[PDB]
Design a protein around this motif. Structure first.
Motif, PDB file in Angstrom:
ATOM      1  N   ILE A  94      56.694  53.360  42.883  1.00 22.26           N
ATOM      2  CA  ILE A  94      55.638  52.730  43.664  1.00 22.26           C
ATOM      3  C   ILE A  94      54.428  52.435  42.789  1.00 22.26           C
ATOM      4  O   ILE A  94      53.854  51.342  42.845  1.00 22.26           O
ATOM      5  CB  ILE A  94      55.269  53.616  44.865  1.00 22.26           C
ATOM      6  CG1 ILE A  94      56.480  53.799  45.779  1.00 22.26           C
ATOM      7  CG2 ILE A  94      54.096  53.018  45.632  1.00 22.26           C
ATOM      8  CD1 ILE A  94      56.367  54.991  46.701  1.00 22.26           C
ATOM      9  N   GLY A 132      49.831  41.908  39.736  1.00 28.05           N
ATOM     10  CA  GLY A 132      48.446  41.620  40.013  1.00 28.05           C
ATOM     11  C   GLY A 132      48.263  40.212  40.545  1.00 28.05           C
ATOM     12  O   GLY A 132      47.713  39.338  39.868  1.00 28.05           O
ATOM     13  N   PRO A 133      48.731  39.961  41.772  1.00 24.75           N
ATOM     14  CA  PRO A 133      48.705  38.591  42.302  1.00 24.75           C
ATOM     15  C   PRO A 133      47.298  38.062  42.525  1.00 24.75           C
ATOM     16  O   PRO A 133      46.318  38.806  42.423  1.00 24.75           O
ATOM     17  CB  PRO A 133      49.474  38.717  43.621  1.00 24.75           C
ATOM     18  CG  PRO A 133      49.273  40.127  44.028  1.00 24.75           C
ATOM     19  CD  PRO A 133      49.265  40.917  42.757  1.00 24.75           C
ATOM     20  N   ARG A 134      47.193  36.772  42.825  1.00 23.48           N
ATOM     21  CA  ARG A 134      45.910  36.108  43.012  1.00 23.48           C
ATOM     22  C   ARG A 134      46.022  35.202  44.234  1.00 23.48           C
ATOM     23  O   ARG A 134      46.982  35.287  45.007  1.00 23.48           O
ATOM     24  CB  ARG A 134      45.510  35.329  41.752  1.00 23.48           C
ATOM     25  CG  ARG A 134      45.310  36.184  40.510  1.00 23.48           C
ATOM     26  CD  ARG A 134      44.093  37.088  40.624  1.00 23.48           C
ATOM     27  NE  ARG A 134      43.278  37.054  39.414  1.00 23.48           N
ATOM     28  CZ  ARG A 134      43.533  37.754  38.315  1.00 23.48           C
ATOM     29  NH1 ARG A 134      44.584  38.554  38.232  1.00 23.48           N
ATOM     30  NH2 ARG A 134      42.713  37.645  37.271  1.00 23.48           N
ATOM     31  N   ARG A 169      44.416  40.418  52.450  1.00 21.01           N
ATOM     32  CA  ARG A 169      44.563  41.612  51.626  1.00 21.01           C
ATOM     33  C   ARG A 169      45.934  42.246  51.818  1.00 21.01           C
ATOM     34  O   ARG A 169      46.579  42.651  50.845  1.00 21.01           O
ATOM     35  CB  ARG A 169      43.462  42.622  51.952  1.00 21.01           C
ATOM     36  CG  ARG A 169      42.042  42.161  51.640  1.00 21.01           C
ATOM     37  CD  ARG A 169      41.078  43.339  51.713  1.00 21.01           C
ATOM     38  NE  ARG A 169      39.680  42.930  51.654  1.00 21.01           N
ATOM     39  CZ  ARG A 169      39.012  42.401  52.669  1.00 21.01           C
ATOM     40  NH1 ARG A 169      39.581  42.210  53.846  1.00 21.01           N
ATOM     41  NH2 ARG A 169      37.737  42.061  52.499  1.00 21.01           N
ATOM     42  N   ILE A 170      46.398  42.331  53.064  1.00 26.79           N
ATOM     43  CA  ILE A 170      47.708  42.918  53.325  1.00 26.79           C
ATOM     44  C   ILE A 170      48.801  42.067  52.700  1.00 26.79           C
ATOM     45  O   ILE A 170      49.756  42.588  52.112  1.00 26.79           O
ATOM     46  CB  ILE A 170      47.913  43.091  54.838  1.00 26.79           C
ATOM     47  CG1 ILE A 170      47.032  44.224  55.366  1.00 26.79           C
ATOM     48  CG2 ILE A 170      49.368  43.369  55.147  1.00 26.79           C
ATOM     49  CD1 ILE A 170      46.632  44.046  56.812  1.00 26.79           C
ATOM     50  N   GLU A 221      48.784  40.444  50.069  1.00 23.50           N
ATOM     51  CA  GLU A 221      48.862  40.612  48.621  1.00 23.50           C
ATOM     52  C   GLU A 221      49.894  41.661  48.234  1.00 23.50           C
ATOM     53  O   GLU A 221      50.495  41.573  47.156  1.00 23.50           O
ATOM     54  CB  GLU A 221      47.488  40.982  48.059  1.00 23.50           C
ATOM     55  CG  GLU A 221      46.437  39.889  48.204  1.00 23.50           C
ATOM     56  CD  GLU A 221      46.749  38.660  47.370  1.00 23.50           C
ATOM     57  OE1 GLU A 221      47.361  38.811  46.292  1.00 23.50           O
ATOM     58  OE2 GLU A 221      46.385  37.543  47.795  1.00 23.50           O
ATOM     59  N   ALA A 222      50.109  42.659  49.089  1.00 24.74           N
ATOM     60  CA  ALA A 222      51.091  43.693  48.780  1.00 24.74           C
ATOM     61  C   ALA A 222      52.499  43.116  48.717  1.00 24.74           C
ATOM     62  O   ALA A 222      53.296  43.502  47.855  1.00 24.74           O
ATOM     63  CB  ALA A 222      51.013  44.814  49.814  1.00 24.74           C
ATOM     64  N   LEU A 223      52.816  42.183  49.616  1.00 23.77           N
ATOM     65  CA  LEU A 223      54.173  41.653  49.687  1.00 23.77           C
ATOM     66  C   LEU A 223      54.575  40.988  48.380  1.00 23.77           C
ATOM     67  O   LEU A 223      55.705  41.163  47.908  1.00 23.77           O
ATOM     68  CB  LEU A 223      54.286  40.661  50.840  1.00 23.77           C
ATOM     69  CG  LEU A 223      54.603  41.191  52.240  1.00 23.77           C
ATOM     70  CD1 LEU A 223      53.516  42.124  52.762  1.00 23.77           C
ATOM     71  CD2 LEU A 223      54.800  40.023  53.181  1.00 23.77           C
ATOM     72  N   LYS A 264      53.445  41.748  45.463  1.00 27.22           N
ATOM     73  CA  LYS A 264      53.667  42.831  44.514  1.00 27.22           C
ATOM     74  C   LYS A 264      55.030  43.481  44.712  1.00 27.22           C
ATOM     75  O   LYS A 264      55.657  43.909  43.737  1.00 27.22           O
ATOM     76  CB  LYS A 264      52.558  43.875  44.640  1.00 27.22           C
ATOM     77  CG  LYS A 264      52.433  44.774  43.425  1.00 27.22           C
ATOM     78  CD  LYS A 264      51.199  45.653  43.502  1.00 27.22           C
ATOM     79  CE  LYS A 264      49.949  44.894  43.090  1.00 27.22           C
ATOM     80  NZ  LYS A 264      48.849  45.820  42.698  1.00 27.22           N
ATOM     81  N   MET A 265      55.509  43.558  45.952  1.00 30.21           N
ATOM     82  CA  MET A 265      56.791  44.197  46.206  1.00 30.21           C
ATOM     83  C   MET A 265      57.976  43.396  45.680  1.00 30.21           C
ATOM     84  O   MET A 265      59.038  43.981  45.447  1.00 30.21           O
ATOM     85  CB  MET A 265      56.970  44.436  47.707  1.00 30.21           C
ATOM     86  CG  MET A 265      55.963  45.398  48.316  1.00 30.21           C
ATOM     87  SD  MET A 265      56.097  45.481  50.112  1.00 30.21           S
ATOM     88  CE  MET A 265      57.111  46.945  50.304  1.00 30.21           C
TER      89      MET A 265
END
Lengths: 154, 49, 49, 557
Positions: free
Chosen positions: A8, A16-18, A49-50, A52-54, A56-57
């Motif tokens: 994780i 580190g998306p944008r 913001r939420i 952005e996690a996807l 990264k996954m």
């Protein structure tokens, strides 16, 4: 057990998306409809913001529209959650109108018993706390005389 | 115990988003936080541990 | 950070934690101490409503 | 012990050299003129430039800066002798003379953060702002006792002598005794120079006579003196000898080209430069740019008069950039210190801290001649609410405690914000009480903007896009230099020019025929001056003030 933890944290260093300039503009059209339905303003900031996690996954170098589809599933639960179980006249006017214009006598309608009156107005004892404790800040003439003199002088 | 959707949220926070290092004054929050509620009496607190 | 019994914590830190959760930094509200530690930690708030 | 020194050669050489320095016979007598001036003015502390000491005798200056106590004592004795030579009676009147230091010191001109332990037992200069003081009590330095029984007199320098050799009573001769006053104050580095990352340094300052009233809490002063330690673990103190005052007043040529009106309008683009990631509220931005600028200094000798300390409040809906705008100003903030909410340290009061007496200067006090950014206004206590009112009116803070009375400068402006308690729309009731602020004193503020989320779908499209574009795959310092130039320019008003502006002031009043107008004449002056300060003009332009009138016109919707 410990191995699953590091995986994780590992992606958080990488990627580190944008914010995509070209892909978002079409997605913005969806938000325009979504903005129609302080709740609205906070929403876009929160959802982005939420999302952005996807990215990264899945090692995504940018944000795709499929992520927004996932955001809908989160909103589906929050939709019922907004009930907390929209009106302006029920909030302030009902407290003000029944303060003095309803009962000129003022006897037996002191602070220790007026809580019962709030029951008929569909106001819980927790909601009046936001009101009762702030009535001294309202500058009410009658409340301060009753509240402060009997606090210590008796 | 616990609903499926609730577990779906948990993963979303742990990965987290990205704090865009803006050159232009203050940067962006880029951090989501969750208030865990639900019905009591199921020893929910121990579950989050 | 996994905060437990958030409603049961002291209000003394509450008057500070409000800004911290938004600016990712804790502030010192003394007379002339301006030191601002970096408090970018996310928050997992579990408490009874 | 009682053993004595017979004619120390170093002391005598120091005395002779310093006396020769003071005896400005071959020169016009600059120091001798100063000695006459001090004798005439009844002051007993001579301030000497260190640079002259270097010029006449470099070795003397080097020894003085490297060794403080004995050199200072010797120089004081030299001053005493020189004064007595010029005038014996003046010397006979007083006991001991004192000497202060001024000028520029190469390596010893340090900041409280930089002033580490390494400068111990050396004369140093410290710059900062006063953060605490105490009241003025007298401390005994030479007590004289007389014993009627034994007909003896005993004198002690600095457990109090109460008993004779054979425990006889001792009634002290107060008149023969000498008492000098004493005061303990402390310092912090300037906000613009002290990093917010690491912990602050506080340095103690002790003031001797003729210095108790020279510095007051909240100003910025220069302190020079001997850095000693009062008695494994030692506490550092600084015995001062001179205190002055500050008065908060290479790219200039680059600036000048920016100020040319032939190329483009600098004001219009400058306004957007302060809120880069906030869409809309362009009128609000112009006001915020106004708040930084504006004149704050008038030729007020021994009194007070009308001031530029008027401030702007911001009320609106949550997440509607109401909270964020404060942060953007706070970041590129000239001479500005943040404080918010409760601030349980006396927001505008010294609070007279006990168990030490310290007088902790508050947020508005430590922010003299700046701008104060305050968030969550309604969070402040009623005492603060009552207190904060007095600051803005007369321009001073009054504190009355148990014996402690104080005068504090409050040359300050406020950029405050607060949520409408529970109000979400706040349009049915006048904001004068609907915003939670109770008194009608809200009219004192310059402006009160309302940022409601009105159903404006056309704007809603632009707001969404503006957030996303900000990534900037492909001018903070510019504004900082701008404010410095306008700080030394006073764009004086011209009544002939002002007349046309004032004519429409009535039309502003008449708008209600088809929320106080009586103060508006005050805010028109500051706003019109602000526009000229952007252009560095010394004369107010008719076009510049015209936009100020429009600012007022849209100020009340």
């Amino acid at each position: 057990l410990a191995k699953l933890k590091k995986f994780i944290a590992y992606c958080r260093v990488k990627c580190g998306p944008r914010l995509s300039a070209e892909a978002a503009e079409k997605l913005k059209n969806r938000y325009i409809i979504m903005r129609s339905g302080p709740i609205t303003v906070r929403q876009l900031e929160a959802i982005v913001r939420i999302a952005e996690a996807l990215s990264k996954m899945k090692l995504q170098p940018f944000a795709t529209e499929a992520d927004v589809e996932e955001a809908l599933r989160l909103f589906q639960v929050s939709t019922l959650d907004a009930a907390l179980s929209q009106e302006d006249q029920e909030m302030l006017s009902r407290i003000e109108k029944q303060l003095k214009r309803r009962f000129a006598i003022g006897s037996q309608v002191s602070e220790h018993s007026i809580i019962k009156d709030f029951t008929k107005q569909k106001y819980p004892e927790h909601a009046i706390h936001k009101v009762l404790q702030l009535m001294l800040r309202r500058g009410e003439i009658q409340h301060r005389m009753q509240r402060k003199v009997l606090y210590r002088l008796k | 115990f616990g609903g499926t959707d609730m577990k779906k949220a948990i993963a979303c926070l742990l990965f987290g988003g990205s704090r865009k290092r803006l050159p232009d004054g203050l940067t962006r929050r880029g951090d989501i936080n969750l208030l865990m509620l639900g019905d009591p009496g199921t020893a929910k607190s121990q579950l989050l541990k | 950070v996994c905060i437990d019994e958030f409603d049961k914590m002291r209000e003394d830190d509450r008057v500070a934690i409000h800004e911290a959760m938004e600016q990712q930094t804790i502030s010192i509200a003394k007379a002339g101490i301006t030191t601002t530690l970096n408090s970018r930690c996310s928050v997992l708030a579990a408490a009874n409503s | 012990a009682g053993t004595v020194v017979l004619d120390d050669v170093e002391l005598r050489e120091a005395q002779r050299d310093y006396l020769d320095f003071l005896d400005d016979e071959e020169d016009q007598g600059i120091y001798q003129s100063k000695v006459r001036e001090l004798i005439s003015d009844n002051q007993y502390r001579l301030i000497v430039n260190v640079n002259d000491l270097r010029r006449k005798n470099e070795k003397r200056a080097n020894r003085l800066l490297n060794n403080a106590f004995e050199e200072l004592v010797a120089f004081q004795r030299a001053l005493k002798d020189f004064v007595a030579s010029i005038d014996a009676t003046y010397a006979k009147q007083y006991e001991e003379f004192y000497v202060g230091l001024e000028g520029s010191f190469g390596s010893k001109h340090v900041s409280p953060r930089t002033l580490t332990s390494c400068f111990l037992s050396c004369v140093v200069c410290v710059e900062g702002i006063v953060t605490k003081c105490s009241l003025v009590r007298p401390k005994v330095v030479r007590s004289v006792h007389y014993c009627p029984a034994t007909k003896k007199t005993i004198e002690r320098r600095y457990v109090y002598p109460t008993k004779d050799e054979e425990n006889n009573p001792l009634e002290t001769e107060y008149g023969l005794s000498v008492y000098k006053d004493h005061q303990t104050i402390t310092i912090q580095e300037m906000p613009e120079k002290a990093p917010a990352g690491q912990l602050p340094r506080s340095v103690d300052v002790i003031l001797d006579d003729d210095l108790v009233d020279k510095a007051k809490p909240g100003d910025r002063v220069q302190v020079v003196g001997t850095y000693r330690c009062l008695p494994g673990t030692f506490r550092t103190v600084l015995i001062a000898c001179n205190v002055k005052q500050m008065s908060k007043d290479e790219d200039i040529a680059k600036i000048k080209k920016f100020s040319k009106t032939r190329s483009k309008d600098i004001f219009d683009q400058l306004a957007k430069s302060l809120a880069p990631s906030i869409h809309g509220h362009d009128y609000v931005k112009k006001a915020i740019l106004c708040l930084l600028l504006g004149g704050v200094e008038r030729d007020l000798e021994n009194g007070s008069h009308i001031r530029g300390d008027i401030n702007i409040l911001l009320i609106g809906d949550p997440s509607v950039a109401k909270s964020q705008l404060l942060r953007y100003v706070l970041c590129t903030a000239p001479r500005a210190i943040p404080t918010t909410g409760r601030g349980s340290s006396g927001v505008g009061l010294t609070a007279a801290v006990t168990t030490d007496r310290r007088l902790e200067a508050g947020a508005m006090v430590l922010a003299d001649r700046g701008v104060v950014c305050i968030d969550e206004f309604d969070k402040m206590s009623d005492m603060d609410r009552t207190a904060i009112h007095e600051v803005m009116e007369q321009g001073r803070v009054t504190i009355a405690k148990a014996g402690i009375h104080a005068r504090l400068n409050a040359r300050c402006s406020v950029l405050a914000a607060a949520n409408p308690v529970y109000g979400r729309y706040d349009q049915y009731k006048t904001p004068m009480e609907n915003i939670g602020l109770q008194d009608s004193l809200l009219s004192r503020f310059d402006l009160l903007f309302i940022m409601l989320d009105q159903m404006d779908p056309e704007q809603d499209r632009e707001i969404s896009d503006h957030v996303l574009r900000m990534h900037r795959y492909r001018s903070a310092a510019f504004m900082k230099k701008y404010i410095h130039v306008a700080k030394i320019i006073k764009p004086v008003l011209t009544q002939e020019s002002a007349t046309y502006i004032a004519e429409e002031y009535s039309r502003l009043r008449s708008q209600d025929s088809m929320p106080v107008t009586a103060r508006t004449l005050e805010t028109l002056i500051r706003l019109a001056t602000a526009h000229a300060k952007a252009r560095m003009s010394k004369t107010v332009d008719l076009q510049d003030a015209e936009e100020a009138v429009e600012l007022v016109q849209y100020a009340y919707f």
